[PDB]
């Protein structure tokens, strides 16, 4: 179940401990068929240089049968919904996640957090919002889910950095959910058991979970304007 994991971090931050090759190896063993590396965007503390993201265009697409997406976990910078990902960085990347992390955007009033998150969602630049359920950052969950559904952004169901409320808001707003391990070692790759239970409780519809198959996720990215990746044709 869910042979896709979309959110993890490499030694590019010292607070992560696994490399691209560790992740490929763990994917192969666990039967994960498609994954994305999404290192923290460069404005954060302990994050890689922006070249880290631009040079991901060099990576192989398929290794040991495992498909590899080039991603970022960009940081929401302001209430205008700007993130620390440049045009050149976008050009090299397949997957844009964005979230709140305190060095870049300190938690503020509910209206502030909400406006920034919705402005990021409305920018058309991001595919997934990471850990929107984080109690550190209070938000209007319903207003966020409705914007995410309108602009076709997935909300993550997801340490160093509200399961039911988000899952139920997405359920009713009609949006996508993305499962992500936020792995900082390859050992938790693809492990998102903690929420699966809640999703079943709130009767979240299986059809709106991106992680169900490589093709469902790739189709979603293509619906968002991504050119088809020919190497993933047999996934």
């Amino acid at each position: 179940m869910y042979p896709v994991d979309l959110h993890m971090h490499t030694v590019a931050s010292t607070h992560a401990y696994s490399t691209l090759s560790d992740y490929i190896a763990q994917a192969k063993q666990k039967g994960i068929k498609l994954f994305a590396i999404t290192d923290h965007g460069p404005d954060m503390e302990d994050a890689p240089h922006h070249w880290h993201f631009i040079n991901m265009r060099i990576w192989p697409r398929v290794v040991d049968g495992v498909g590899i997406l080039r991603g970022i976990e960009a940081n929401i910078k302001n209430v205008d919904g700007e993130i620390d990902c440049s045009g050149k960085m976008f050009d090299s990347l397949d997957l844009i996640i964005a979230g709140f992390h305190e060095p870049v955007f300190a938690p503020h009033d509910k209206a502030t957090n909400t406006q920034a998150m919705i402005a990021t969602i409305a920018s058309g630049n991001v595919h997934i919002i990471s850990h929107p359920g984080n109690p550190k950052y209070e938000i209007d969950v319903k207003a966020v889910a409705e914007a995410a559904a309108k602009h076709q952004v997935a909300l993550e169901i997801n340490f160093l950095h509200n399961c039911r409320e988000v899952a139920a808001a997405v359920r009713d707003a009609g949006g996508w959910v993305a499962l992500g391990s936020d792995s900082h070692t390859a050992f938790t790759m693809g492990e998102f058991e903690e929420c699966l239970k809640i999703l079943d409780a709130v009767d979240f519809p299986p059809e709106r979970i991106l992680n169900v198959s490589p093709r469902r996720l790739l189709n979603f990215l293509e619906s968002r304007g991504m050119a088809p990746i020919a190497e993933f044709a047999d996934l």
Copy 2:
């Protein structure tokens, strides 16, 4: 012999070249049953962010049968025996090694060094003093061995950064020795054949070498205040 290595460094410093996964693979190959990663403390040049240590809490305890300890090689900060390890770092770690490294504590007058080391030993915060037999830092030795025995701190017998003196001296003072490779690649993991023969030179008592077994070392840590690690119970 000595299936425990307690002092090694990962790519969290650019002057080291191996990852957690490299150390695991090597441990498996060399029959090492328990090991600790002890990356340089954050005040040192070319050392990781403090989050590198806090986030070690996420690591698996046992991989491929090998136990994994979360450590630091802290740098002695000042004559008050302070080290560059915060309380939040402590909370995340099992093993606290500390030692003199030039960028942080420029070697000074004997008395400065000693006030400093014997005071680190006396802080109760430290488990092992790394390469105390290093000529770049002169210290009252017989005396350091006597404080180490008094305070239950092991002295390492041990590039970029006297064996007999320490070995004979710890022998007579009644304290513990800890063997540590100070590996900066996984290739030298578990290799301390150099000082060892100087140990059989002073007829060092077999029962005061921590590395003889995982349980011996783990009981030592527990005696120093560490809660028992449930996953190592069968080690």
Copy 3:
């Protein structure tokens, strides 16, 4: 063919993604018998600390039958041909590559770039000039190739960082060496020099002046430049 690759980068830069062990494993799989790690010199952005280079002296020489050279891709710093490699770094390293990279030396007038590159060559401190064919740094290719032959420096035949026929033909006539280098930033492209090869043959480049044909040829070149012989490689 070309069981030697001399130019590649590890996670010591975040714009690279592979470790020493990843390169070892790939060399074995690809039949590479000798390779060098040549991380970006410390003056560049996103480059390691200088200790990254000094401490390479601890590396094993041969792992699983593959020989490992300790290198640097140093940055040309100025028109005096200085590079960001210290005496203590030189003492730890086997192989010295140097090249232009934006943050350290900005592309300037053809004569500036030329003077800087030739002075580096003429320093005697360098074995190989990396991607001299880079269109971002206009040079007098003939004057460079002639300096390189005089001072026994190899020119590389060669995204982020990022004339191939013009370099090879200049080296051909000047009578110098060429070195092949993948400039890998993951181990997946290790030993991969397909692109320029057809053009080397197109210009009748003499194969006897390609360093990479065998480990011994490359090692003999380094010894010729003053490197004490590496005992552990005696059988390569």
